[PDB]
């Protein structure tokens, strides 16, 4: 199948070389048929031009499309809505801290003068001051970092003492994190605990950890790897850095356009399903060759769906193509079944890249604009407040500059 015997065969093998799949095997074949002195001048220019230069062109065109589309009236309006919501949340958090300080002073003055209720409320206020402290932050980070170390040392043929040590340490850490979650919910309040999304993730992870402990008690063998997700709480190490704003705004933009991300991952799923069903029709049951039945077949739906997913990721799509050609009669009469794989690796390589680069660019540009705008507003408000207080007592990236220019053009 991989020969230059014909213009159609040559087109097919050059296309398979473009995708950089089995392109060195073709080069090695021309290194055996002829000398190796000149074959690289055909394949390395081929890879560079049709694979690295064309990917560069696609990236540039796609990024320009994303830049133009970002600075449109409705997309800009949605971003301004998100920015306004973030500013409102900041102001509301500050004022809530104000009102809680008022709570504390009122409770103190009332205690100096329902006794059970007052004691309970003062204890609740002490806990809410404790869970918000910088010492609680670091003790929880140390507990988490010690927990990841415990699961990092799990290996094959670990000592029996280590297995039991980590078995009991998992219980210790689960109890400590349940205590930490209960303390945070009591101090902050269950409505305010679930206010930040990362506490929602922590609650979900602790629930999953309890469920995994129960299931391991029921069925010892099965491990879901859910207790490992507590390692994601090391992402708070970023709160003591000047990079919390960017990463937090990235997560804010992701959670904002989550109903557009999930509906993007479902159109990809539907296209994968459609191509899996089409491959089931074309090659379903026809991969039972002599001496071998490939695991990458289209016989069932799980098999077809995995085969289509693997062709989308691009790896070894050519071997599946050779099987799908040889299943319809070989080179003589089955070579028009390569259009399935050509279409699936063309309109799947670039729709994957389109969708995921669109998600990444939209959300990272939203995060950039959010953090830049909050810093700009902070500095402008600082200047205004300093000037008024004195009154009463007496670079940029190419992307950002082009985005500003497109904003002026659209207005």
């Amino acid at each position: 199948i991989t020969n230059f015997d014909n213009i159609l065969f040559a087109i097919l093998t050059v296309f398979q070389c473009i995708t950089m799949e089995g392109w060195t095997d073709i080069l090695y074949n021309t290194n055996d048929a002829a000398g190796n002195t000149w074959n690289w001048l055909y394949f390395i220019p081929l890879i560079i031009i049709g694979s690295f230069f064309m990917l560069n062109l696609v990236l540039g065109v796609l990024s320009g499309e994303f830049a133009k589309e970002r600075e449109r009236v409705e997309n800009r309006r949605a971003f301004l809505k998100l920015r306004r919501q973030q500013q409102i949340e900041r102001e509301l958090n500050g004022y809530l801290e104000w009102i809680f300080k008022a709570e504390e002073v009122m409770l103190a003055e009332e205690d100096r003068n329902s006794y059970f209720r007052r004691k309970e409320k003062m204890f609740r206020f002490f806990i809410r001051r404790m869970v918000k402290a910088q010492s609680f932050y670091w003790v929880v980070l140390c507990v988490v970092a010690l927990n990841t170390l415990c699961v990092a040392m799990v290996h094959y043929n670990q000592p029996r003492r280590l297995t039991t040590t980590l078995y009991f340490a998992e219980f210790v850490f689960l109890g400590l994190f349940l205590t930490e979650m209960s303390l945070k919910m009591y101090g902050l309040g269950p409505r305010s605990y679930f206010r930040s999304s990362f506490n929602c993730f922590d609650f979900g992870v602790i629930v999953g950890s309890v469920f995994e402990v129960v299931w391991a008690a029921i069925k010892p063998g099965s491990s879901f790897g859910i207790s490992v997700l507590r390692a994601l709480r090391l992402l708070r190490i970023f709160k003591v850095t000047k990079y919390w704003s960017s990463l937090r705004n990235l997560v804010v933009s992701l959670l904002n356009s989550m109903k557009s991300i999930i509906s993007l991952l479902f159109l990809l799923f539907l296209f994968i399903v459609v191509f899996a069903l089409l491959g089931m029709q074309l090659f379903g049951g026809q991969f039972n060759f002599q001496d071998e039945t490939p695991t990458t077949n289209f016989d069932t739906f799980p098999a077809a769906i995995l085969t289509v997913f693997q062709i989308l990721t691009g790896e070894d799509w050519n071997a599946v193509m050779y099987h799908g050609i040889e299943s319809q009669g070989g080179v003589s009469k089955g070579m028009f079944s390569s259009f399935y794989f050509i279409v699936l690796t063309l309109f799947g390589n670039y729709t994957l890249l389109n969708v995921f680069l669109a998600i990444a660019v939209d959300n990272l540009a939203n995060a950039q604009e959010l953090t830049k705008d909050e810093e700009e507003m902070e500095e402008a408000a600082n200047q205004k407040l300093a000037l008024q207080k004195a009154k009463e007592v007496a670079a940029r990236s190419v992307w950002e500059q082009r985005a500003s220019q497109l904003r002026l053009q659209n207005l």
């Binding site: 102001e91 004022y95 809530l96 104000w98 009102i99 300080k101 207080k389 007592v393």
Partner: protein
């Protein structure tokens, strides 16, 4: 008077939970910051109508000692409501610069103050229309610390002037 009488206004009508608590946090900051230098007194006499007149002269003899006086009034929700009076108190304005965050504050403050949401937001908007010059101090800050430091700096400047 020798020392201008410190009075807070700006979140919403007095008596309501959010306004009372924000103003009480500011008052407690002033009290534990200016202890021995400021006076906190609760007043039930409508200064805007100037039993009413009995308290104003009491305010002078607090203010006639070269010491700052802070007023816990309960009937003034306007700067011009005290413009016709001879006392002329300092109007420190705690500006919530957006009705949305104030509405969220009201909703968060239990369920009792939510039933008076419309009138309280209307009063906040009423204070919003007032020109900024009618208020002596504008407190746009979101944090307690920033607003308290702004007010404390202004009070230090006033103390140095007087």
């Amino acid at each position: 008077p020798s020392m201008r009488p410190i009075i807070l206004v700006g979140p919403s009508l007095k008596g309501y939970e959010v306004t009372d608590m924000m103003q009480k946090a500011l008052f407690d900051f002033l009290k534990h910051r200016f202890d021995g230098r400021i006076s906190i007194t609760r007043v039930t006499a409508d200064i805007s109508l100037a039993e009413v007149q009995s308290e104003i002269e009491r305010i002078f003899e607090l203010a006639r000692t070269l010491q700052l006086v802070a007023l816990d009034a309960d009937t003034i929700n306007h700067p011009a409501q005290l413009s016709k009076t001879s006392l002329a108190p300092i109007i420190v304005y705690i500006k919530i610069t957006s009705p949305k965050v104030l509405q969220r504050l009201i909703k968060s403050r239990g369920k009792s103050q939510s039933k008076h949401l419309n009138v309280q937001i209307a009063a906040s908007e009423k204070l919003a229309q007032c020109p900024p010059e009618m208020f002596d101090i504008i407190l746009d800050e979101n944090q307690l610390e920033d607003a308290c430091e702004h007010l404390a700096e202004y009070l230090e400047a006033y103390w140095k002037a007087t």
